[PDB]
Ligand binder design. Sequence first.
Ligand SMILES: [Mg+2]
Ligand SMILES: [Mg+2]
Ligand SMILES: [Mg+2]
Ligand SMILES: [Mg+2]
Ligand SMILES: [Mg+2]
Ligand SMILES: [Mg+2]
Ligand SMILES: [Mg+2]
Ligand SMILES: [Mg+2]
Ligand SMILES: [Mg+2]
Ligand SMILES: [Mg+2]
Ligand SMILES: [Mg+2]
Ligand SMILES: [Mg+2]
Ligand SMILES: [Mg+2]
Ligand SMILES: [Mg+2]
Ligand SMILES: [Mg+2]
Ligand SMILES: [Mg+2]
Ligand SMILES: [Mg+2]
Ligand SMILES: [Mg+2]
Ligand SMILES: [Mg+2]
Ligand SMILES: [Mg+2]
Ligand SMILES: [Mg+2]
Ligand SMILES: [Mg+2]
Ligand SMILES: [Mg+2]
Ligand SMILES: [Mg+2]
Ligand SMILES: [Mg+2]
Ligand SMILES: [Mg+2]
Ligand SMILES: [Mg+2]
Ligand SMILES: [Mg+2]
Ligand SMILES: [Mg+2]
Ligand SMILES: [Mg+2]
Ligand SMILES: [Mg+2]
Ligand SMILES: [Mg+2]
Ligand SMILES: [Mg+2]
Ligand SMILES: [Mg+2]
Ligand SMILES: [Mg+2]
Ligand SMILES: [Mg+2]
Ligand SMILES: [Zn+2]
Lengths: 238, 153, 99, 308, 148, 108
Amino acid sequence: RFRPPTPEPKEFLEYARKAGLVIPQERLERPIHLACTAGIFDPYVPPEGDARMSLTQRTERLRKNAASQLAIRKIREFDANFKTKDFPEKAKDIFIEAHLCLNNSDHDRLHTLVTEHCFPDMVWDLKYKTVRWGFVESLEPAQVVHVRCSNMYGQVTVRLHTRQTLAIYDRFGRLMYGQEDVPKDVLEYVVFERHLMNPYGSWRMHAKIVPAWAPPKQPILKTLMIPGPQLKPWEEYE
Amino acid sequence: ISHGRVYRRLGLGPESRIHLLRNLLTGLVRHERIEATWARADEMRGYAEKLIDYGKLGDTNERAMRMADFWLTEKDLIPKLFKVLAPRFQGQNGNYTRMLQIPNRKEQDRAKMAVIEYKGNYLPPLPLPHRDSNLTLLNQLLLGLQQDLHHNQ
Amino acid sequence: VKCTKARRLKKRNLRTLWINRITAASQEHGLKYPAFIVNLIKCQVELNRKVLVDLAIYEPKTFKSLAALAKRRQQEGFAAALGDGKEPEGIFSRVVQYH
Amino acid sequence: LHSKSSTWWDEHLSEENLSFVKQLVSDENKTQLTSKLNPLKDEPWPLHPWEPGSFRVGLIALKLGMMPLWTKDGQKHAVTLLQVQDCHVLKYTPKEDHNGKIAALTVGGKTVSRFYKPDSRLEFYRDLGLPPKQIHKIFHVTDNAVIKPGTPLYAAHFRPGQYVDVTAKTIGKGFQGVMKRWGFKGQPASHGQTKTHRRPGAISTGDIARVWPGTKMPGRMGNQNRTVYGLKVWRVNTKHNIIYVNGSVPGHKNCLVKIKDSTLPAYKDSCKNLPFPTYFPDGDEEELPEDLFDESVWQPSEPSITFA
Amino acid sequence: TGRGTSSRFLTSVLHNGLGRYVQQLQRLSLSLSRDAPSSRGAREFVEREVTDFARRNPGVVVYVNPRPCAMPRIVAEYLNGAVREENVNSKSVEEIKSLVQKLADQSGLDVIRIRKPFHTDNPSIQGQWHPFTNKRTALHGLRPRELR
Amino acid sequence: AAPKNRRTIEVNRCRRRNPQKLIKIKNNIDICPECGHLKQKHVLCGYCYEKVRQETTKIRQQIGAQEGGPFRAPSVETMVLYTGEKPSEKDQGKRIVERNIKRPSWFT
RNA sequence: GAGCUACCUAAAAACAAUUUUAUGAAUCAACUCGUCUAUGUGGCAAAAUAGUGAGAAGAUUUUUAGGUAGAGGUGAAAAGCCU
RNA sequence: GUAAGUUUAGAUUAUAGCCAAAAGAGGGCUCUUCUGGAACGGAAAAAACCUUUAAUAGUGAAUAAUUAACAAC
RNA sequence: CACCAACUUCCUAAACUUAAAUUGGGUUAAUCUAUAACUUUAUAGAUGCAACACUGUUAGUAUGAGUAACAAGAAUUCAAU
RNA sequence: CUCUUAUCUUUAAUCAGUGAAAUUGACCUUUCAGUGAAGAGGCUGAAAUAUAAUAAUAAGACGAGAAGACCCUAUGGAGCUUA
RNA sequence: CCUCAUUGGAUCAGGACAUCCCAAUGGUGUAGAAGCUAUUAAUGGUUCGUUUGCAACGAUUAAAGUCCUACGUGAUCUG
Ligand SMILES: [Mg+2]
Ligand SMILES: [Mg+2]
Ligand SMILES: [Mg+2]
Ligand SMILES: [Mg+2]
Ligand SMILES: [Mg+2]
Ligand SMILES: [Mg+2]
Ligand SMILES: [Mg+2]
Ligand SMILES: [Mg+2]
Ligand SMILES: [Mg+2]
Ligand SMILES: [Mg+2]
Ligand SMILES: [Mg+2]
Ligand SMILES: [Mg+2]
Ligand SMILES: [Mg+2]
Ligand SMILES: [Mg+2]
Ligand SMILES: [Mg+2]
Ligand SMILES: [Mg+2]
Ligand SMILES: [Mg+2]
Ligand SMILES: [Mg+2]
Ligand SMILES: [Mg+2]
Ligand SMILES: [Mg+2]
Ligand SMILES: [Mg+2]
Ligand SMILES: [Mg+2]
Ligand SMILES: [Mg+2]
Ligand SMILES: [Mg+2]
Ligand SMILES: [Mg+2]
Ligand SMILES: [Mg+2]
Ligand SMILES: [Mg+2]
Ligand SMILES: [Mg+2]
Ligand SMILES: [Mg+2]
Ligand SMILES: [Mg+2]
Ligand SMILES: [Mg+2]
Ligand SMILES: [Mg+2]
Ligand SMILES: [Mg+2]
Ligand SMILES: [Mg+2]
Ligand SMILES: [Mg+2]
Ligand SMILES: [Mg+2]
Ligand SMILES: [Zn+2]
C-alpha cells in the first residue's frame, strides 16, 4: 500500500504567476482614506541668496499675500486661530521633537508628528541602524515663507536656520555618516501640513524643500565602486 | 592487458567506431572547425591528418579516389579535398590539424570537449595560448645570457 | 552495579598498593616486607600499613629508624632461639604488659 | 589569488627562449660528460690487486631486444642485447655506514632531462658534476674493488665467457585473476557449471574459521623486481657498448637492468681474469677489437659450418 | 557515578579553624502561608523554635515571610557564595528543626565526591623521598665503571 | 550477504570524511588577459571562445543562404569580408561571404 | 463471481509455398504449443528472455455474445480448473 | 541444651529438576534410598567441589580455603 | 619457620543475620470530582491510573548506501538540414 | 576435454544526474592454545597491534531469505474409503 | 514370529607421521643381484583410463602412503 500524492497546496502571487491568471481589477467598496497628499501643492521656489544672511523675506510674503494670504483666510475659516506670528515657534517644537524620536526609534510618536509622506522618508533607510541626532542652538528665529491650500489641506512652508549633529551607525556600531559630536549649521525649508476638515486634524511635518543653490552635503566615509557596463560575449565596449 | 594498442574502443564495435569517426571527418572537411568530445576528437585527428596526404597524391590516383570516396559520405566534398584542402597544404610536411581543449560541456554530462580544425581556414581565429613576450623580466635575463654566450664565441 | 562493586574492591586495591610501597621502602634498608612488619609488631608498635607508607614517602629518616628497630628485634629473635636454655631476654624484646 | 600556484619550466619562456634553453641544457650535458671521460688522469683512487673473495661493481644497462646466435656446434641460442648507457659511479659508502660486512657503490645510467625532477635529485647531481640519471642502484663491492665517484663504466667491463646475473622489473600485467596469476585449473565450461569458470575454489578449511596469510588470491600481477641467475656472456660490442647475454631478461624493451657478476656457487672467483677495479679505456694499455666473441660462438663472415 | 560526576579535594573556606572559627551560614529565608495545610509544621517552627535558633546563631540573619504561599521554602546563603534551597512542604516541626541545624553547621562547599579524607599543606618535615635518599655516595663521586 | 549489524555514525563518519573522498582543490585556475574572466591554464578561455563561436555561427548562417541547398559546397577557397572591404587581387576567384557588421578587432 | 480458466450453445473468421495424393498424409512459414539448455531469480516478467524445438486442412486455431456456481459446476482423471 | 508445637479459619502455586558423595538393585548406563550444594574468595576459565550467618559507609585490622610437588644396591 | 588473602569476624558509625513460582503487609507517580489552597499545594472520593521487550499497531527517522539499478546515434547554419 | 588462449560487445571501473532491497540488541568488531553442548572477536593464559579509505576473494559471523525436509505432541483440523 | 536406514566428484588444499617413493643407517638363514626386518627422518612428490555403483580390471610409475580438518571446502560449482 501507499499514501496519496496530495499536492499539499507571499505565496499566492507565485502560485498565480507560474500558473498565470486573469486578475480582474476590483472596485473598492470602501474608499481608501488619505490624511495627507503626496507632493506639495505649489513648490515654493527659494529666492537666490536667501542663505548666508548672517525680516525682509517676510515682507516679500506680505507682497505675495495676493496668492498666499487668501489661503490663510481659509485656514482661519476652519480653525480661526492659525496666526503666522506664533506658528514659527510651534513649528520648531514639531521639528525638534520629531527628529528626537529617531534616537529612541519611537515610531509611534512620529506618526503623530509627521504625515504619511514623511515617515517613509525618515525611517525606511534607518532600519538596522542607530542614529544619534542632537539639536544645537538655533542661529536665527524661524519664519513662515509660503502658505497654500487645496479633502482640503493647507501647507505652510517654514524656513529654519539651525545647528545640528548626526552620527548614524551600522548594525555593528561602526560609524557610517557624520562626526560623533561636531556642530554644523543647516538652512532647510520645511513644509508642514494639516487636514483642515477632520475634527482631529493638527499640524504635522509633510516634506522639505531643497534649494538648487544649496551646498553639497557631507560624503559618506566609505569608498564606493560604481560598476561599469556588463557585456555578454556578443557586445563590445564603447 | 592493452599494452601497445593504438585505438580507443568507441561506438557499438569496430565497424561502429569507423562510421562514427567517418561522420566527424566528413563534418570537419565541410566546416573545417568541429566540436566533439576530447576522446573522439583525439581519435579522429589521426584520420584527419592522413586524409590530406591522400589528397596530395592527386586527383588521377585511383587509390586516393577510392579512399576519399569511402571517408567522405557527402560526395560534394571530394572536389573540395583534392582542389581546396590539398593545394593549401602543399608546403607543409605534416601537422595539418590544430586541436585544443575547451571548457567542459554544460549539459549535465560534463564531457571533456575539444575544438579540432584544419590550419589555414577562413573562420575567426581561435583564442590560442600565447607565450610571454621577450620583454618580461625572466625572458630578458635569459635574453641577456644568450647575447653574451653567442658574442663571446 | 559496577559502581557498587568497585566500592569494596577499592579497599583491597589500596592495601595492595600500600604493601608494594612498603616493600619498596624496606628493601632500601635491606629488609624483606614480612620481616619488617612482623618484628615491628613484636615491639608493640601498632602503626598500620596506610600510615607506614606515609612515613616512607614523607619521613624517610623516621622510617629508617623503624627499619633499624625491626632489624634489631629480628636480630634479638635469632639469638634468643639460637641459644637454647635460659638466656636473658633481649633489650628490645621486652613486652609491656597491661591490666 | 594569494595561494599556491603550479608552474613548469616552459610556462614563462618565450618562443625564442624556448629553443635557447633547450640548446643550453643539452650543451651542458655535453661538457659535463666529457669532463669525466678520463678517470685515471683525475686523481684516481689507489688500484688494489685482486684477492680471493672479492666482489667488484656492476653496470646499469638498457634492454635493446633479442636476436638469434649460433655456436660452432650449429646450435642456435636466443640472446638478449643490453646496452651500457651513461653508466657512472655515483656514491660510495664504507663497510661501517652501510651496516653490512661489505661496502656499497651506487651506480646510475641513462641520463634524462632535468625539467621535471625534484630539486633534491638535481642538487645531488650538481655536486657530482653529472647530468641526472634515470635510475640508481646499489652494488656490494669489497674494499679492494672500490672506485671513485664520477667514474664512467663501459660494456668492456664484462668479457665473453663470464656468467652474469640480471635483475629488472618484470612486465606489468595489471590486476589479474587466479588462473593467469597462479595457474589455477579453474572449473569446467559445461555440464551444469553455474557462473563459476575461472573462480578460486574453496579458500580454506572450515575449522580454522579464517584465511591463512599468504593465500593466493586475485591481485595485481607483474611490475616486480626479479633476477635471472647464471646467464653467459657470448659477445661484447665495444663500439656501441652492447653485451650479448644468453636467454631472457626480465622487463620490457627499453627497460633498465642491473648487471653484475653471477653469484652462483660455480663461478665463485671467476673475476680473476676480468678487469678487477673496472675496465679503463683512458689507460689505453691496448686497444680492444670492436667485437669480442666467445670461442664457441660462430662469427658471421666465417666459412659455413661443415661438421666434417 | 564517580566518573559521571565532578570531584574536589578536602578544603576550608578561609582556613576556618586556624585563627578563629567563623560560622559559614549567614542568612536563612523562610516563606510561609498563614493558612495552608502544607505549611502547618513550618508555622509551629516560627512560633516555638525560630527565636531560640536566632539567639544561638547571632551571625545568621533570619527572614520570616508569611505570605499567600503554596509550598514553604527555606533559602540558605553562605559567605563563600553558595545558595541552597529546601522544600519544607508538609514537614513536622521536628524535621524542619533538624534540617535548619544541619544547614548552619555546613559550609558552602559543594557536596560532591571528595577525593581524599585528609589534606596537608606541609606533608613533609624531614624531606620528601627522592631516588637519591638511601643511596650512599662514592669517593670523588665516581660513577660506576668510571676509570678516573 | 546482508549486514549483521547496523553501522554507527562514528564508523560512517570516518569513511565518508576520509581525505580520499574529499573534493581536491585546484591550482590550475588563472585569468584570461583579454577579458579578465577565469580559465584553467591548459584549456581555452570559455568567454573569449564564446565570442568566436557566436561570430562563426553567423558566418555559417550566411554561407547557407548563399548556397541555398544541400550538396552545394564550392570547389574553390572561401573568404569572409565585412562592410567597407573589397576583394583584393589575391582574393580573385574565391567564394566571398559578406557580413553586415564591421570587421571585429580580434578577427584579422 | 465463468471478461481468467474447464466445458458447452449460437453467429462469425484464418491457413502462403511445395510434394503427395485424395489425407486427424509429407516438408515448412503465419499461427498454436512449450521439448532441452543457458540467462534471470525483488528479475523486462508474482513464470519472462535468448536459443533450440512439437503441431501447422484439423479431435486445428482464433473472435464475439450467451450457459452451467460451491452440499455445486466443469473434467480426452492431472483430485486439473472455477479471476 | 534450647523455642518452638497442636488445633481452628482462609488461600493459591506446585506435581519434569541439576551436579557431587555414600549403600544397594537391575544390567558403562539405568532405577531406588541417605547427605550436601547454587561466591562477590580458591581450584585456570569453573551453576553443582572447598572456604563463607544477613547488608551498610570507612585510604583500618586479624584471618579461611588456596595446582602444585621434590634415578633409588 | 613466616607473609599475603573473602566486611568470614573485630574495629568507628550502624545493623540484628541466606535460586523463585507463590503468599502477607507498608508507601507511591499521574489525572478527574468535593472542600480548600493560589508560581502549583492539603484531606477525602474516584479511574481508560505508570511499558527497555508481545516477528505488537500507527507515524517518524536511520543502517545497508550515495551502494544495486536506471537514460539521449553524429555533426552543423539546430516540429531545421 | 588434454590445456587453455586472443578479439569484440555486455557488465565492471572512473566522471555527471537520479536513487532501491532483504538485513540491523549494542559494538571501541584481532591471532593461537585452553574451557565448553561437535561449538569463542568478546571467558582463562600467552601473543600481536599508528589511523582511515578504494578495488578484489568467500574461511567464518552454527551469515541472510521462502509457506522446505525429518520425528513426535494435541481428548486441534480436513480430504478420501468402507465391512 | 519378522525387521532396517548421509556420501561421490570439481576447485583450492592446511596439518599429523603410525613413511608409499626420494635420503642416512643396524641385523640377516645379507657371496653379487634381488629381498626381509628394525631404527631415523614429514623433505618434496605421490598418474591416466575402462566397466562401474561400490567395486572390478587395463596400461604406467621412483612411488601411485595411511589418516585428521563438521562428505575439510554447496553465500565456489556439481551427481
Ligand atoms: Mg593495461
Ligand atoms: Mg593504451
Ligand atoms: Mg583484604
Ligand atoms: Mg578449463
Ligand atoms: Mg558460464
Ligand atoms: Mg580462529
Ligand atoms: Mg575505528
Ligand atoms: Mg466465456
Ligand atoms: Mg497451405
Ligand atoms: Mg499433417
Ligand atoms: Mg516440425
Ligand atoms: Mg510431424
Ligand atoms: Mg480438455
Ligand atoms: Mg490418476
Ligand atoms: Mg483463485
Ligand atoms: Mg557479614
Ligand atoms: Mg526470587
Ligand atoms: Mg492502561
Ligand atoms: Mg514509550
Ligand atoms: Mg530479528
Ligand atoms: Mg513493541
Ligand atoms: Mg539512508
Ligand atoms: Mg556494498
Ligand atoms: Mg552499476
Ligand atoms: Mg553517480
Ligand atoms: Mg579494532
Ligand atoms: Mg580455540
Ligand atoms: Mg584474551
Ligand atoms: Mg565505489
Ligand atoms: Mg563470509
Ligand atoms: Mg493428552
Ligand atoms: Mg478431535
Ligand atoms: Mg598439503
Ligand atoms: Mg618417524
Ligand atoms: Mg560454506
Ligand atoms: Mg558473491
Ligand atoms: Zn578570455
